[PDB]
Amino acid sequence: KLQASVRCLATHGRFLEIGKFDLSQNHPLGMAIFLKNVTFHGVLLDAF
Amino acid sequence: LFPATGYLSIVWKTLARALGLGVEQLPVVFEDVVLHQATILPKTGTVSLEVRLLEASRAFEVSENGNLVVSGKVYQWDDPDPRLFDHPESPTPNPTEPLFLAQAEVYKELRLRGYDYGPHFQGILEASLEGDSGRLLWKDNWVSFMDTMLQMSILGSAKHGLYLPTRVTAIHIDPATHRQKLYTLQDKAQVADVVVSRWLRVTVAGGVHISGLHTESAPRRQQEQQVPILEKFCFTPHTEEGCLSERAALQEELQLCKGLVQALPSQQELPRLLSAACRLQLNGNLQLELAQVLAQERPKLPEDPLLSGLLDSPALKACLDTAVENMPSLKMKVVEVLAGHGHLYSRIPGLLSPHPLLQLSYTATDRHPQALEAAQAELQQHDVAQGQWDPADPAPSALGSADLLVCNCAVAALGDPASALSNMVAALREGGFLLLHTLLRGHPLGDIVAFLTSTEPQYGQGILSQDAWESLFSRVSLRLVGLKKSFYGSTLFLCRRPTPQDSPIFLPVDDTSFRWVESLKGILADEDSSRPVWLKAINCATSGVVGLVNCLRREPGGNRLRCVLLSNLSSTSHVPEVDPGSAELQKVLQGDLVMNVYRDGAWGAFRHFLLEEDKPEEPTAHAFVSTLTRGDLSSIRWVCSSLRHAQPTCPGAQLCTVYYASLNFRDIMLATGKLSPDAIPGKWTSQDSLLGMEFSGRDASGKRVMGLVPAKGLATSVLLSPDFLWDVPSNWTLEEAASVPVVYSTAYYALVVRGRVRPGETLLIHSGSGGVGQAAIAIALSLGCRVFTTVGSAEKRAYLQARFPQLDSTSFANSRDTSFEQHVLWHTGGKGVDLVLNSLAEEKLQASVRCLATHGRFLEIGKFDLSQNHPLGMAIFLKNVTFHGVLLDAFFNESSADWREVWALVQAGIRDGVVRPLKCTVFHGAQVEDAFRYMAQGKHIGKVVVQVLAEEPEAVLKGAKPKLMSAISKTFCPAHKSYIIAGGLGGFGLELAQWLIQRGVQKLVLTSRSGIRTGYQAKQVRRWRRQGVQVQVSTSNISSLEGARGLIAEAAQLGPVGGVFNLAVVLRDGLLENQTPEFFQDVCKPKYSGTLNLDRVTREACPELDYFVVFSSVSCGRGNAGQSNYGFANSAMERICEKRRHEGLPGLAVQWGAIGDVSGTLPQRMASCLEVLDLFLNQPHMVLSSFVLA
């Protein structure tokens, strides 16, 4: 699901990841998505 | 190359073997397929591939000799779903077009692109014009089927060039559903429908489903490309005097020589011999002492420019070609005499290489075996034979009867003129040629040689007066056909052995109904008769009889043909009379030469010569740097620019002069060949230079400006919108301003806009010594941030510590190594850095991601890792961090409203002193190659700029026009003009129109009798129309003058007529026996009459015409059997074009050998044809040719 949603992005898109499963398991994320200007966000509310 | 689908097949078979199932019972899924290299299949030998599987990780790997080739994931599809293969919702619901691409058209297009497939990979039976649907063949093969799916995906791409798969995200296969989907047509062949969805990026065809295909541009650079032979068709007078007048070296050498001759100094051998002769004694010189001297014993006299003058000149080529033409057979027998000293053997074979069919048997004969004992390997490399003939002695029978005889008596010594020529003629075949290169006694150089060389009478006897030679030729009953005389005395005789006088057959060929064809067809059929037939055209100056006779000579009975032509390009020049009792006819009959063309008071025949290799150059104010040969920095040279048809007046245009232009890393990558032209965002023409990104100069109003261009920033003029311009403050020099735009714009966009840097943060800026690094450091220090910067070397550290004093000794690290991770983490307390500007490689990039603190921000401005798609662990995101991919090029493609923010930021920086120009190293425009090499070295600190024009002290200059510069000439067309391509829907017409549109035509009229009748034509026309090109189809036949006038009027409505190209060909092949006058009329209707009517109408009401091209064929001039009418039509077109050019109007006629993509010569690829067409269009000659030898 996480890989599929990344393919939905447009140029100048922003990806807000709030789920903590793939991040914890440290799954790979191909950097080719960033040729399209894309901002990848790791959003955790606990930091506040 | 091994197909990627082949790798898929072998991996699938290995998995099937491992599981124990077959390949038709194992639905499979491929995930994250990555191809690292393309394995080349050698013609001989075999390549071993190794496939390894990791069942636990579901990962496979293919390797060749230990080098990884393919990697990815594979596993059996547990529960296949037939729904996955239902054809997706079509991108275009209702194309509503009956026309479609057939197989031949599809693969013609793929060939033009660069893909060369054979029958086993020609699986596309048909496809839609848009390329989003079709039908594929099933031959029980999987590699072919999936490769055909990839072909369907590639076909609809609008990107010209060769693209090969590099990554695929998912491939699903289901043999059961594949069998279900297959359906047989009327023939026994099985087919499967294919749908390509570009919106969803899926290709489904039967039982396969590719999702996420990625294709990267290939270099498309094939070694040993074609080298077409380029020629110019021109009239050579039979008699030429003062051949070498224009050349200066010969004149100066003669001044040096004959000055010494006065009263009884250079590197040339003859002047050195003269100086040595005069040195020993001023008076009373000994014949022996001057005859012999050191450095003169060698046979270097032929190497003297004077003694080799006429030979180097095209005159020798003219005589050799004339000898070649008048030959009853298709083979040459040339025997040389006194070859040891004459030395012609090194020259004659080289000149006759172009003739594709001619085969010659050269023989070098000399009096003594030791003579010519040297340079044996030089003879061996050619096909030449030894000879032992003494000119005084009768010729040996081994030489026998020969068609051509070459002497070079200027250097070699003839025993006795009369006896030597008697032996020659005795050896000369009936109806043969004698070639003689002598020095006329009584001329200056003749006198010089006479005073010298008096020791050897044999050589002395060689030097004779011209009248003596002419009289002697009569004595040996040898007739003279031509003479090539130099301005100092060198002469090149050419004599022909008379043939038994026979009654000739005369036939007027000037009938406009082509009824003479029957008359000649009757005559030539009498093969028993040996009398020659003398076709003569005297009524019209645009007859095509020359090509007719050229093509007939290949046909049976051709040896009996002879042509006469009266084509005077000047009306004032009197037309001669060829009545049987008139002199000229009898003299030419005595000549016995096939081609007898009279033009402006001089008999002669058309001949070929190789055009000058040097590329043409013209002065211009608009030129752009280009790499002529990809990847070779030595090929960088200035080329004329399309801005010549642009206006500074328009506001959105604002054509700006360029004083200084700067070079960035992208430019070096592009020129050196590492980076591809297609990788630069935007719609770029196939042929165009994409070098340069910023500049400085004077706006059309003289105000100084620094700009930002997507490309083409390196030229003498740039077409830029006002939104990408700034103003150079009164304190800055223009040299400095050119370094600001790209680096500071990208630095601001990366930090302020994306990273939202705030005062008091910590930054890790990589490669501080670079422009972007320096700009980032300057921006960071203005706010007050602590900055860690990585510099490769020590002098860079010194420069950065001197330039930015605020930096402390603990603010620097090492960039060439991954040890900056420990420096940053130690000096930060282990917390990290709040912002990272990274432009380093894979391992460096990974080491940088470990320097980010909580709430960090990683700015990526590099491209290697992104392009290669290296993985990035997502555990870094558990701590709040944002990963930005910063590409500044997106602004030129769109997002101007976003661009205004960066523009305001840069302007504020300039107005507040933050923006500071970098150090510059100016290289003059004439040494752009030097600048590229210097920046490729890698030692530059700052920016490397080019001074394309020196600055003036004035603040504002009213006229900022670029100074004229000499650069290569390229063909561009104004936007507002209209161009007519008669027969433009044919094979060559469509490609010519595509080429012209790339030069900016924008208004086209394509003429064809039937119209748009094929899918490919409709596809191309629709593509052109969508691009904003006002294409049109006429159906106005140019054979009828009314049709030509209507065609021109129709073109005039779009805009003023710019140029007309005639490519309308109707061909009816057949030998003379089959030919009939109706076929001749049909063949000559479009090309001869069409050209006549086009010329008339254009001279009438086409004032601005600048291009009048006409595509002839090599069958004309060169000759070809069974195409007499075609040659006649082409020759008539050539005559018309020659007439046009003489009156100042434009005109051209290109002769092509054979076009391949769409007579002993291989077909020529379209790209080479277009390059050659450009070159010919830029040259000043009337008729040109191009062909590729076998």
Ligand SMILES: NC(=O)C1=CN([C@@H]2O[C@H](COP(=O)(O)OP(=O)(O)OC[C@H]3O[C@@H](n4cnc5c(N)ncnc54)[C@H](OP(=O)(O)O)[C@@H]3O)[C@@H](O)[C@H]2O)C=CC1
């Ligand atoms: N938004 C975007 O997409 C943009 C991308 N960029 C990219 O940002 C980066 C910064 O460009 P810029 O600073 O002007 O580059 P420069 O070439 O001006 O400076 C290069 C710096 O990095 C090092 N370096 C880079 N390439 C080489 C090389 N081939 N050989 C040796 N050293 C090299 C140098 O040595 P060292 O590090 O050892 O001191 C130096 O510090 C580039 O990769 C550029 O393409 C720039 C602008 C726009």
Ligand SMILES: NC(=O)C1=CN([C@@H]2O[C@H](COP(=O)(O)OP(=O)(O)OC[C@H]3O[C@@H](n4cnc5c(N)ncnc54)[C@H](OP(=O)(O)O)[C@@H]3O)[C@@H](O)[C@H]2O)C=CC1
């Ligand atoms: N090997 C080669 O390709 C060589 C070809 N050439 C030259 O190349 C040129 C182009 O040939 P190419 O396009 O490849 O081959 P084509 O057979 O396609 O050339 C004929 C084209 O012109 C059209 N045409 C025919 N008659 C007329 C007419 N009366 N008025 C207008 N259009 C007409 C034809 O369409 P339609 O039938 O519907 O009218 C067709 O599109 C020709 O002029 C030929 O002399 C010469 C040297 C070598």
